[PDB]
TrEMBL record, chain B:
One of its GO terms (biological process) is symbiont-mediated suppression of host JAK-STAT cascade via inhibition of STAT2 activity. Keywords: Host cytoplasm, Host mitochondrion, Host nucleus, Host-virus interaction, Inhibition of host adaptive immune response by virus, Inhibition of host innate immune response by virus, Inhibition of host interferon signaling pathway by virus, Inhibition of host IRF3 by virus, Inhibition of host IRF7 by virus, Inhibition of host MAVS by virus, Inhibition of host RIG-I by virus, Inhibition of host RLR pathway by virus, Inhibition of host STAT2 by virus, Inhibition of host TBK1 by virus, Inhibition of host TLR pathway by virus, Interferon antiviral system evasion, Modulation of host cell apoptosis by virus, Viral immunoevasion. GO terms for cellular component: host cell mitochondrion; host cell nucleus. This is Non-structural protein 1. Its main location: host cell. Belongs to the pneumovirus non-structural protein 1 family. Monomer. Homomultimer. Heteromultimer with NS2. Interacts with the matrix protein M. Interacts with host ELOC and CUL2; this interaction allows NS1 to form an active E3 ligase with ELOC and CUL2. Interacts with host IRF3; this interaction leads to the disrupted association of IRF3 with CREBBP and thus reduced binding of IRF3 to the IFN-beta promoter. Interacts with host MAVS; this interaction prevents MAVS binding to RIGI and inhibits signaling pathway leading to interferon production. Interacts with host MAP1B/microtubule-associated protein 1B. It is found in: Host cytoplasm; Host mitochondrion; Host nucleus.
Length: 136, 132
């Protein structure tokens, strides 16, 4: 597949902060513009049960693949385990100025052993969606 | 060493024409623990193409481990778009005889309902992260 971006994914456990280097691939045909992305992305694991009613918004998404460079397998095995239990990664893009991509959601299939990133086409809708699920 | 199989018949909460069947195989050891979990539970799913997460949310005291599932098969009629689905449990059935070949085409994740406090924690933490 076609490499589109590399950088760091900072996993904040909020039980502290594990920092795991990773690549983002898209399909042979696909095209994505990652030059405006930061080198570091910040993630917090949330129960992926919460994502169910964001189903329609998630469906209107660009799907990407994450590949971890296995620098510290120790960190990665923690990620495999928690995400395998049913936790998805909310991934914030740090920006002081407004850019396109601000958030994606990272899901892990234990069967297929792949990390999928979902990038909502409607970024604002999605963040507001997250809010409306967790707010009361 | 002995294998069981449970059939959960489901209908979509928002469209009772959309139906699903969930086949779960387990060791007869835990067959009872599993049925108890399902008896006191809601089933949601997230479809992403050929990846199907099945969320079994339990009110039951003990929440099973994911590994008590050996194989799991999720079939729907009709085929569904990628997204999320809330199901109603229509019928549970034991037919332990696991002779039938089973496609492991989904992955089940057991969990408990979230307290208002944990839910508040996430609200706080996601508000910080995403900036809302």
């Amino acid at each position: 597949k076609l490499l589109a971006w590399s950088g760091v994914l900072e996993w904040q456990e909020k039980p502290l902060t594990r920092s795991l280097p990773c690549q983002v691939y898209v399909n042979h045909g696909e095209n994505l513009k990652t030059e405006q992305w930061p080198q570091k992305l910040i993630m917090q694991l949330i129960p992926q049960q919460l994502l169910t009613t964001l189903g329609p918004l998630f469906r209107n998404s660009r799907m990407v693949q994450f590949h971890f460079t296995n620098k510290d397998l120790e960190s990665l095995k923690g990620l495999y385990r928690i995400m395998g239990n049913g936790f998805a990664g909310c991934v914030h893009f740090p920006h002081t100025a407004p850019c396109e991509v601000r958030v994606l959601m990272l899901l892990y299939s234990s069967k297929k052993k792949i990390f999928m990133g979902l990038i909502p086409y409607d970024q604002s809708g999605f963040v507001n969606g997250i809010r409306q699920v967790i707010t009361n | 060493n002995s294998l069981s199989m449970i059939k959960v018949r489901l209908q979509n909460l928002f469209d009772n024409d959309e139906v699903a069947l969930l086949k779960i195989t387990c060791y007869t050891d835990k067959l009872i623990h599993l049925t108890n979990a399902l008896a006191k539970a809601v089933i949601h799913t997230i479809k992403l193409n050929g990846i199907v997460f099945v969320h079994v949310i339990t009110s039951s005291d003990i929440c099973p481990n994911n590994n008590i599932v050996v194989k799991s098969n999720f079939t729907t009629m009709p085929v569904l778009q990628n997204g999320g689905y809330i199901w109603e449990m229509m019928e549970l059935t034991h037919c332990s005889q696991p002779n039938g070949l089973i496609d492991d085409n989904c992955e089940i994740k057991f969990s408990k309902k979230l307290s208002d406090s944990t839910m508040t924690n996430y609200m706080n933490q996601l508000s910080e992260l995403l900036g809302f």
